[PDB]
Amino acid sequence: TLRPMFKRLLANAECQEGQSVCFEIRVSGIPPPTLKWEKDGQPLSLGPNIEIIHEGLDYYALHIRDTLPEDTGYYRVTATNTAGSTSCQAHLQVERL
Amino acid sequence: TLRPMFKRLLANAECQEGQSVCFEIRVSGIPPPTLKWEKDGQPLSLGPNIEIIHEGLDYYALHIRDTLPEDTGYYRVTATNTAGSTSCQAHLQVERL
Amino acid sequence: TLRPMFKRLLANAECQEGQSVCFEIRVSGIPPPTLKWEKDGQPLSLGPNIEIIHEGLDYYALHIRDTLPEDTGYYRVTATNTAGSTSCQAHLQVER
Amino acid sequence: STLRPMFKRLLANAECQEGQSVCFEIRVSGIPPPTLKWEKDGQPLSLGPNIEIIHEGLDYYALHIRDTLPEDTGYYRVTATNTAGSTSCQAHLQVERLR
């Protein structure tokens, strides 16, 4: 039994509107923690252009394609299991033109 | 609060070695269920070419690129929340050249 | 100048309907040759769920997603430059 | 029986952060369908391991540059040619340093 711990935290990013952007984390824990994603403190809605990818043992990626100005904001991830919780956030800046 | 429930089950799949294969499910639930994937009864090991994608509201896909014969087997997914659990499975046959 | 040559030829393929399939080739030549693709002797119908990919190391790929039974058939690629031309083909079988 | 190539959607200036991907998208027509040459700053484009050109339908082409480096900054040009003539357009890519 091991509390969830980030091995790789979210990092701030910027992209141009219409382009794609990727955020990435690695989070470990026994049992494998479940994740909750938020934007500006509200539950993240994936919609048509956002996807969450799970690879490897602890690797998760948040991918946005066809980014829009509205996608600008603070993205938070929270990992939880029976032993504890841990959370981090980063900012996405979608630039105009 | 409602028990998790597949709106689209895993379906049996087949591909040629070196090609890609995709399993797709759709599971709803309030609260949104957490998923657990298994291969032949053991916890699924996401290798280098295996990824799990979450899209939309309840869309989940298991993607395997560049399949190898080792990927042959029974894949199971369990969706759990505070109201209960649901599970389904299907078979993947990677055919050699 | 140099005649186009297939460093990797098309190989026969099979896929289940609704899944994806990829045909890969490697073509060299100076000048870099232009490619023309056919299916069953007629120009390849470039529509949804079909894409032609070009990447480094002379790599070219024909990718088809969400295959339908109509996608079964013989796919041919012809490479041509000023020094000549070369062609090869392979079969795709869509299965249920 | 011929028709000079014409851009229906042109390359657009782009910007991305080092390490992210950037995409350029065009639509070009013409009879017979034109062949394309891609250039970076007047030189033929070398795709390396990180660039792929995707052709969909008859007119759509996308230039995907992944794992961008600041040295990728420059002017990218595409030229479409058939037996009836040629047409060309270019855009600028700025790969901003992570710092």
Numbering used by the authors:
A (entry chain A), B (entry chain D): 8 to 104
C (entry chain C): 8 to 103
D (entry chain B): 7 to 105
Sentences from the paper on this structure:
Titin has a molecular weight of more than 3 MDa in its longest isoform and is over 1.5 μm in length, spanning half of a sarcomeric unit from the peripheral Z-disk to the central M-band. Taking titin kinase as the N-terminal boundary of the titin M-band segment, there are another ten Ig domains towards the far C-terminus of titin, referred to as M1 to M10, encoded by at least six exons 358–363, or Mex1 to Mex6, on the respective TTN gene. To achieve this goal, we have solved the crystal structures of five titin M-band domains: M1, M3, M4, M7, and M10. In addition to the ABDE/A’CC’FG β-sheet sandwich core, all M-band domain structures comprise two characteristic tip regions, which we refer to as “N-tip” and “C-tip” due to their proximity to the N-termini and C-termini of the respective domains.
